[PDB]
Amino acid sequence: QVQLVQSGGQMKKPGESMRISCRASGYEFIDCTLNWIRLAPGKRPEWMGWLKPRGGAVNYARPLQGRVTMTRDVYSDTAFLELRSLTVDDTAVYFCTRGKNCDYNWDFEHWGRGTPVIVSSPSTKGPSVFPLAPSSKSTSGGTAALGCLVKDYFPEPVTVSWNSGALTSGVHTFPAVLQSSGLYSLSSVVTVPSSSLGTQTYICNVNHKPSNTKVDKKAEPKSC
Amino acid sequence: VLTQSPGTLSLSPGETAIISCRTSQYGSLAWYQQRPGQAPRLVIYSGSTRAAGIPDRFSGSRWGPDYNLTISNLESGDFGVYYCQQYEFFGQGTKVQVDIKRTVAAPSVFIFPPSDEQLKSGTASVVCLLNNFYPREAKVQWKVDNALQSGNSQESVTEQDSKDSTYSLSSTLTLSKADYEKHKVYACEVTHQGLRSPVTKSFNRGEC
Amino acid sequence: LENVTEEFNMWKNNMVEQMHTDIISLWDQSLKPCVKLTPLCVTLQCTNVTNAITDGELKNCSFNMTTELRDKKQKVYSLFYRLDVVQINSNKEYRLINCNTSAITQVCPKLSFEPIPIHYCAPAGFAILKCKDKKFNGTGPCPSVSTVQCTHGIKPVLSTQLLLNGSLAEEEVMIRSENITNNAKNILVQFNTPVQINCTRPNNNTRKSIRIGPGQAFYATGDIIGDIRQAHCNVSKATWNETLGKVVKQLRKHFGNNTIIRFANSSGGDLEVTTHSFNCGGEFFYCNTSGLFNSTWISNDSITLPCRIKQIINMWQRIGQAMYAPPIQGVIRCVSNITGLILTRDGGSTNSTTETFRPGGGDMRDNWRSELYKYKVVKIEPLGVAPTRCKRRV
Amino acid sequence: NCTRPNNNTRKSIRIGPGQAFYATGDIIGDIRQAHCNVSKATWNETLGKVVK
Amino acid sequence: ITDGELKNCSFNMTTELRDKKQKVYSLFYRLDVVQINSNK
Ligand SMILES: *[C@@H]1O[C@H](CO)[C@@H](O[C@@H]2O[C@H](CO)[C@@H](O[C@@H]3O[C@H](CO)[C@@H](O)[C@H](O[C@H]4O[C@H](CO)[C@@H](O)[C@H](O)[C@@H]4O)[C@@H]3O)[C@H](O)[C@H]2NC(C)=O)[C@H](O)[C@H]1NC(C)=O
Ligand SMILES: *[C@@H]1O[C@H](CO)[C@@H](O[C@@H]2O[C@H](CO)[C@@H](O[C@@H]3O[C@H](CO)[C@@H](O)[C@H](O)[C@@H]3O)[C@H](O)[C@H]2NC(C)=O)[C@H](O)[C@H]1NC(C)=O
Ligand SMILES: *[C@@H]1O[C@H](CO)[C@@H](O[C@@H]2O[C@H](CO)[C@@H](O[C@@H]3O[C@H](CO)[C@@H](O)[C@H](O)[C@@H]3O)[C@H](O)[C@H]2NC(C)=O)[C@H](O)[C@H]1NC(C)=O
Ligand SMILES: *[C@@H]1O[C@H](CO)[C@@H](O[C@@H]2O[C@H](CO)[C@@H](O[C@@H]3O[C@H](CO)[C@@H](O)[C@H](O)[C@@H]3O)[C@H](O)[C@H]2NC(C)=O)[C@H](O)[C@H]1NC(C)=O
Ligand SMILES: *[C@@H]1O[C@H](CO)[C@@H](O[C@@H]2O[C@H](CO)[C@@H](O[C@@H]3O[C@H](CO)[C@@H](O)[C@H](O)[C@@H]3O)[C@H](O)[C@H]2NC(C)=O)[C@H](O)[C@H]1NC(C)=O
Ligand SMILES: *[C@@H]1O[C@H](CO)[C@@H](O[C@@H]2O[C@H](CO)[C@@H](O[C@@H]3O[C@H](CO)[C@@H](O)[C@H](O)[C@@H]3O)[C@H](O)[C@H]2NC(C)=O)[C@H](O)[C@H]1NC(C)=O
Ligand SMILES: *[C@@H]1O[C@H](CO)[C@@H](O[C@@H]2O[C@H](CO)[C@@H](O)[C@H](O)[C@H]2NC(C)=O)[C@H](O)[C@H]1NC(C)=O
Ligand SMILES: *[C@@H]1O[C@H](CO)[C@@H](O[C@@H]2O[C@H](CO)[C@@H](O)[C@H](O)[C@H]2NC(C)=O)[C@H](O)[C@H]1NC(C)=O
Ligand SMILES: *[C@@H]1O[C@H](CO)[C@@H](O[C@@H]2O[C@H](CO)[C@@H](O)[C@H](O)[C@H]2NC(C)=O)[C@H](O)[C@H]1NC(C)=O
Ligand SMILES: *[C@@H]1O[C@H](CO)[C@@H](O[C@@H]2O[C@H](CO)[C@@H](O)[C@H](O)[C@H]2NC(C)=O)[C@H](O)[C@H]1NC(C)=O
Ligand SMILES: *[C@@H]1O[C@H](CO)[C@@H](O[C@@H]2O[C@H](CO)[C@@H](O)[C@H](O)[C@H]2NC(C)=O)[C@H](O)[C@H]1NC(C)=O
Ligand SMILES: *[C@@H]1O[C@H](CO)[C@@H](O[C@@H]2O[C@H](CO)[C@@H](O)[C@H](O)[C@H]2NC(C)=O)[C@H](O)[C@H]1NC(C)=O
Ligand SMILES: *[C@@H]1O[C@H](CO)[C@@H](O[C@@H]2O[C@H](CO)[C@@H](O)[C@H](O)[C@H]2NC(C)=O)[C@H](O)[C@H]1NC(C)=O
Ligand SMILES: *[C@@H]1O[C@H](CO)[C@@H](O[C@@H]2O[C@H](CO)[C@@H](O)[C@H](O)[C@H]2NC(C)=O)[C@H](O)[C@H]1NC(C)=O
Ligand SMILES: *[C@@H]1O[C@H](CO)[C@@H](O[C@@H]2O[C@H](CO)[C@@H](O)[C@H](O)[C@H]2NC(C)=O)[C@H](O)[C@H]1NC(C)=O
Ligand SMILES: *[C@@H]1O[C@H](CO)[C@@H](O)[C@H](O)[C@H]1NC(C)=O
Ligand SMILES: *[C@@H]1O[C@H](CO)[C@@H](O)[C@H](O)[C@H]1NC(C)=O
Ligand SMILES: *[C@@H]1O[C@H](CO)[C@@H](O)[C@H](O)[C@H]1NC(C)=O
Ligand SMILES: *[C@@H]1O[C@H](CO)[C@@H](O)[C@H](O)[C@H]1NC(C)=O
Ligand SMILES: *[C@@H]1O[C@H](CO)[C@@H](O)[C@H](O)[C@H]1NC(C)=O
Ligand SMILES: *[C@@H]1O[C@H](CO)[C@@H](O)[C@H](O)[C@H]1NC(C)=O
């Protein structure tokens, strides 16, 4: 039964080698082409290269040369892949597939389970909490965006609450907008009614636990 | 090279879903199913040939560079991410998003300035709360001085919040404080199915 | 055959694959009666050869073997190339290569290997067609068909990355591939003019022998009578540099215009697929050709190609098989000419500014598909009816 | 129905260059004998037919 | 063991080099083992 059993986790740190492996089974290893795909989340998937058994003849993509390397052990039916000089953008799952027959390459019948390699860098990128103020003092029938933006925080995650969990419903926690700097910025707004704006100083309680800190700021109405 | 559209398929169950590529060069096409969090599987191949173990509600078309995927009678095991391969190049992925049926909604444009805590530091951040939306399929128009000056922002939405079964859209700005005086005029114009015109509401920043 | 138009396809032709079957059968059914070398494996203490050497790629080993009586040790020695010797872990204890995987068989040193040309002939009730015309990218129609009994001269020469002693093209360089947009396919170029190459080696080696059991003999290398220099292989920089111009010109035609074409060496694999392997006189070479392909193309000087020699080989890229090549006395001087290239293209990013081609390999079924693209085997059917104005009277 | 609770292991020993001998490794579990079950009703009323 | 019908033997065999002893072991059924004539 054609089953491709991968091997490993894992987490890494930058600038180190890494090594994964595909123990193929259920077919003649010495006769069919293998393939390698880099399913990174939220982005366009990417093929990396082949490895023909029986010769060991390889091919690689062009945005990977000088770093990627493929090889096999024909006596243990085990392909291998390595990559030097991993950056933090090399977080994904690495799949190792095979086509259906052994005549056409790109027909990815069989897939393997996935080897999610995650590179983490030491980078502070601490608290930058920007609460959002309701200018409406008390507008009867109006609802304000009592929210809070975080600027250039890293790494994941980051949360937000208000006055130790006073505002729990209506918290439209918008997804984090990845800015052009490579740093994500969280946005979050809360539907708060009219008279509740000036009733208590609702403190934007953004937890910055990946930096082991937190900054709590209020979003009182302005004066202009 | 490979372009997929639309990026979001907000559909109800029991319906039909249409996803379309458009290639340039000559070569076979296939569609894969990223069933969310598992190893994907090949749904269609050779342009329009089903794979083994794949139900008959899936077929391809058409002439020239254009291609489709049909998903008749959308069920639970079909909500996922859909990829379109040509030999080695993939497409960016379309998402078939589940939607429960609701009556059309009443809009509201709520735009509020940043606080005096970190406005003065040399930054700025203005949002546009857009409550009570239906459907998901909509366009945001952050108009500044009656001109689209969004830039690096993103139409980042939440889910259909099942306490009201409504959406909440947004649009932001990443401007600095040093040229913030250029953008004192704010407007959001968002249309829907229950709207003849995009909703708008002028809010001055000389009233605080 | 005037007015006859057939259609050929050189990639679905089955003359190539059944020849490949029959070639590898001949190398196996011939070596049944060729001794063996099961007792060759030993701890085999070894040093460096101390001769006048311009260069540690040749070693002076020593080992115990069995004499005529099968109860007395006999301490013998011979030379081994660097690639035949493996370190296990004072002085250094080495192991023979491919002991833990396979069994080693010495090819009998009375059997010639010289590629004598082959003529394939069809039996009765069949016929062989032949497409004499030109401008044939292996498929499509053929206006000039004939009928022959036997295919022309085919010479089984097991080379890689560069076709030697092939058949030249007609007028231009003919480039043929199954599909040019498909990267998992090889490209076959065919020259309309040869480029000559000269491989030598200053060896002048000696031959020894060791009786290994009653009636068995193992032929080893004796000593070196002369000096030591490496092997090499020369190609001229004028017939070569104005051959890739012709290949660039036909490659430029498929991909378009304003395509920068780069050539670059092999990117990885087994020794068999990243080097060129000859067979001159009964020796197996492995020459570095990364200087024929290092070039970019927009809009008495020669090239020395270094070479390595190995004696325990595995011709067919199989599992558990090896053979020991016996040495030959004298200096080898072999002249050949190159008629073709096997290329492959790197996939990857969408920049229509540069394409990069590397030497391809990994398959013996491309040396032959270059030669059997002219023929197609048909089957005769003698019966047939038609209406006429003729009546059998009873 | 013949069973056996074996759950044995497989080892190997290289015995000469390119030869392999497959042996039994160890026992991962307990040891019980094999057996084979037949029903006493379909059997005891089959020999009645043969006797007849 | 709920039952001496399975034995744990041990023996010398030749390794990759044909000049070094290698002491190995495996299991054998009772029927594969014959007594010739301390330990056995
Ligand atoms: C195709 O051509 C490329 C060149 O464009 C070629 O890549 C080069 O390969 C060589 C080896 O073949 C590499 O050379 C090594 O370089 C390192 C420096 O990083 C040296 O330290 C190495 O020394 C080794 O050998 C010494 C003895 O000579 C030992 O004492 C030492 O400990 C090392 O083992 C070695 O010279 C080189 O890095 C690459 N790259 C470049 C840019 O040169 C490639 O090999 C060619 N393809 C094939 C199939 O040959
Ligand atoms: C490599 O293989 C592919 C796979 O077959 C070949 O693609 C096929 O190419 C032919 C010729 O261009 C296409 O046929 C034509 O399609 C157009 C569509 O508008 C039509 O107008 C023509 O009448 C004809 O039908 C065919 O569609 C195409 N196959 C696919 C799946 O797209 C390709 O040609 C091969 N390359 C080479 C160099 O042989
Ligand atoms: C590789 O090393 C081996 C052994 O170390 C060399 O073989 C030995 O070569 C020496 C040469 O100094 C021989 O010594 C001389 O031999 C003659 C005849 O045997 C004798 O009359 C002299 O008195 C002197 O001993 C030696 O016999 C020979 N053999 C052995 C078993 O030691 C070998 O020459 C080296 N390889 C090369 C290429 O030189
Ligand atoms: C490509 O074709 C040429 C033509 O046959 C091959 O050249 C021939 O190679 C053989 C190799 O054994 C030469 O034979 C040797 O000749 C010398 C002196 O003539 C003799 O001392 C040896 O005993 C041996 O017979 C032969 O001379 C040579 N040239 C000819 C026939 O004109 C070449 O080897 C082919 N390339 C490959 C890779 O096979
Ligand atoms: C096949 O031939 C190629 C082409 O010559 C070989 O590449 C060359 O290999 C040498 C030694 O491995 C390299 O020389 C070294 O270069 C460094 C550069 O700083 C220098 O510091 C050293 O002192 C030494 O000279 C050379 O750079 C390299 N690349 C070229 C010429 O582009 C290749 O190694 C050969 N392949 C095999 C498998 O033998
Ligand atoms: C049958 O008997 C043989 C030999 O009497 C057993 O093999 C030996 O089993 C023992 C278990 O106590 C091993 O001892 C331990 O081994 C590990 C790794 O070798 C070591 O770290 C410990 O300190 C301890 O020595 C011993 O190695 C092993 N092999 C030999 C050659 O003695 C075998 O287990 C018996 N059969 C069964 C089914 O248990
Ligand atoms: C070749 O055979 C000789 C003779 O058997 C080996 O010499 C023995 O080497 C071992 C190694 O420690 C010694 O313990 C013995 O005492 C030696 N015996 C004699 C009679 O000298 C020798 O090791 C073998 N191999 C090589 C490479 O020389
Ligand atoms: C046969 O022996 C060779 C001795 O070199 C083995 O090659 C080494 O094996 C180890 C263990 O897998 C690797 O870490 C090394 O990279 C190998 N090469 C070298 C040069 O040391 C070879 O693997 C053995 N064959 C088998 C089937 O195990
Ligand atoms: C290769 O080495 C052999 C020796 O093994 C050389 O043979 C000699 O040849 C010359 C004539 O060229 C004779 O006069 C000698 O008597 C020969 N020696 C022996 C021992 O027979 C042979 O010439 C060498 N070939 C070269 C130099 O290429
Ligand atoms: C192979 O090509 C080289 C490149 O020039 C030739 O080179 C030199 O030739 C002279 C004359 O014999 C020698 O003195 C040099 O030692 C040679 N150098 C090298 C690096 O070989 C060489 O003669 C050519 N030889 C053959 C047989 O083709
Ligand atoms: C390859 O070998 C051929 C055959 O020797 C060489 O061609 C001869 O080269 C010499 C130069 O010394 C000329 O005098 C001859 O006229 C050439 N032709 C013949 C038929 O002998 C050729 O030069 C070699 N190529 C190299 C060294 O790259
Ligand atoms: C392969 O191409 C490279 C790039 O041009 C060559 O590298 C240069 O070679 C010349 C002469 O060989 C040297 O003077 C330069 O110094 C080299 N460049 C650098 C950066 O050092 C290389 O020689 C080519 N190799 C072959 C065999 O053609
Ligand atoms: C027979 O023994 C093997 C061990 O050699 C058992 O394999 C284990 O199977 C379980 C699942 O049933 C896995 O979780 C273990 O990781 C396996 N162990 C190893 C070492 O692979 C096998 O299950 C046994 N079969 C039985 C009990 O009938
Ligand atoms: C084989 O037949 C025997 C006879 O009854 C069955 O016996 C017992 O089954 C229970 C339930 O598992 C066990 O606890 C006992 O240990 C069994 N005793 C014996 C002697 O086997 C037994 O289950 C049957 N098994 C099969 C596989 O047919
Ligand atoms: C022989 O094996 C068959 C197959 O398991 C047994 O038949 C089953 O026995 C179980 C009793 O646990 C029943 O529940 C099933 O209905 C039987 N049929 C099938 C198709 O599973 C049979 O009992 C065994 N005979 C013995 C133990 O003597
Ligand atoms: C002998 O060769 C080995 C490897 O070939 C090398 O490490 C050593 O330095 C050499 N010794 C001498 C004396 O040449
Ligand atoms: C190689 O060819 C190109 C194009 O003909 C030429 O410009 C270049 O000078 C040539 N180099 C040599 C060494 O002949
Ligand atoms: C490509 O260049 C050649 C130069 O001879 C020219 O004849 C041909 O028309 C060009 N083709 C295109 C499509 O530009
Ligand atoms: C090619 O090589 C052969 C043998 O070396 C030689 O006879 C022939 O003249 C060469 N040139 C050709 C066929 O153009
Ligand atoms: C076996 O068969 C005989 C005849 O049918 C019956 O008398 C006897 O009791 C049976 N025994 C069992 C154990 O069923
Ligand atoms: C070992 O087995 C033998 C025969 O199988 C038996 O005679 C002996 O008593 C057993 N000894 C032990 C300790 O089990």
Author numbering:
A (entry chain C): 1 to 52, 52A, 53 to 82, 82A, 82B, 82C, 83 to 100, 100A, ...
B (entry chain D): 3 to 27, 30 to 91, 96 to 216
C (entry chain A): 86 to 136, 148 to 184, 186 to 309, 312 to 323, 323a, 324 to 396, 405 to 406, 412 to 505
D (entry chain I): 295 to 309, 312 to 323, 323a, 324 to 347
E (entry chain I): 149 to 184, 186 to 189
Task: Share the article's original sentences.
Host cell entry of HIV-1 is accomplished by the envelope glycoprotein (Env) spike. The gp120 segment binds the primary receptor CD4, triggering conformational changes leading to the binding of co-receptor CCR5/CXCR4 that causes global rearrangements in the trimer structure leading to viral and cell membrane fusion and gp120 shedding. In the pre-fusion, closed state, typical of SOSIP trimers, the gp120 domains surround a bundle of three gp41 helices, protecting conserved fusion elements of the trimer. In this study we combined structural and mechanistic information to construct a mutant Env that is no longer responsive to triggering by the CD4 receptor.
The F14 mutations consisted of the layer-1 mutation V68I, layer-2 mutations A204V and V208L, and the outer-domain mutation V255L. The F14 mutations predominantly reside in V1/V2 near the apical region of layer-2 and in layer-1 near the gp120 contact with gp41 HR1. The results for the F14 construct indicated that sCD4 triggering of the open state is nearly eliminated based upon the lack of 17B response together with a ~11-fold reduction in 19B response. To understand the structural basis for the observed lack of CD4-induced conformational rearrangements, we determined structures of the F14 SOSIP trimer in complex with VRC01 and the F14/Vt8 SOSIP trimer in complex with VRC03 and 10-1074 via single particle cryo-electron microscopy (cryo-EM). A total of 77,632 and 84,378 particles yielded final map resolutions of 3.0 Å and 2.9 Å, respectively. However, map densities in the C-terminal portion of HR-1 in both F14 and F14/Vt8 trimers displayed a helical extension of the buried three helix bundle toward the trimer apex, a feature that resembles the extension observed in open and partially open SOSIP structures. As a result of this gp41 restructuring, residue K567 displaced W571 from the layer-1/layer-2 pocket that was formed by residues F43, C54, W69, T71, A73, C74, D107, L111, and T217. Interestingly, the F14 map displayed layer-1 loop densities suggestive of multistate behavior. Specifically, density corresponding to H66 and H72 in a configuration similar to that of the F14/Vt8 structure appeared alongside additional distinct densities, which may correspond to differing H72 sidechain configurations. The first strategy that led to the F14 series of mutations identified the conserved W571 as a conformational switch and effectively disabled a communication network that relied on the movement of topological layers 1 and 2 to transmit structural changes from the CD4 binding site.
